[PDB]
């Protein structure tokens, strides 16, 4: 079942409230996972971590293991969940 694996959505639990949402696309090991987001939609930078402080949410997208940005974008689009994933919070600049 989707948990620390593809399809399961995760979010920055602590750091800047909740201004970053990501999904796991590639699993290296139990700790080493690659998280990413919709490139053209939200602009989520992909990063490979050993799970430092990242906790999954309740929401899940409909994809398989071994997907791409293309895959996620289209499947997210169909599920109408694109806007929720595009939703940006705490995107405030330090100086303005």
Provide CB contacts within 8 A for 3, sequence distance 6+.
56
Closest CA to 12 of 24, 25, 23, 21: 21
Provide CB contacts within 8 A for 43, sequence distance 6+.
37
Domain residues for the domain of 25 are: 1-87
Kindly state whether residue 92 falls inside one of the protein's structural domains.
no
Cα 60–Cα 64–Cα 70 angle in degrees, nearest 5: 90
Contact in structure between 34 and 25 (CB atoms under 8 Å)? yes
Kindly state whether residue 48 falls inside one of the protein's structural domains.
yes
Kindly state whether residue 96 falls inside one of the protein's structural domains.
no
Structure tokens at 81: 């969940």
Helix (H, G, I), strand (E, B) or coil at 36: strand
33-36 vs 47-49, strand pairing mode = antiparallel
Contacts 24+ apart (CB under 8 A), 89-94: 89/17, 89/18, 89/19, 90/16, 90/17, 90/18, 90/19, 91/19
Q: Specify the experimental method.
A: NMR
Kindly state whether residue 43 falls inside one of the protein's structural domains.
yes
Kindly state whether residue 28 falls inside one of the protein's structural domains.
yes
Q: What is the CATH number of the domain that holds 77?
A: 2.30.30.30
Structure tokens at 4: 């620390």
- How many domains does the structure of the chain reveal? 1
């Amino acid at each position: 079942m989707p948990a620390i694996e593809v399809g399961r959505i995760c979010v920055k639990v602590k750091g800047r409230e909740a201004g970053s949402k990501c999904v796991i696309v590639d699993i290296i090991d139990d700790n080493f996972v690659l998280v990413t987001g919709p490139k053209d939609i939200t602009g989520v930078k992909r990063r490979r971590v050993n799970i430092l402080h990242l906790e999954p949410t309740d929401k899940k997208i409909d994809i398989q293991k071994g997907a791409s940005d293309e895959e996620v974008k289209k499947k997210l689009e169909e599920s109408n969940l694109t806007e929720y994933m595009k939703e940006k919070i705490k995107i405030r600049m330090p100086t303005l």
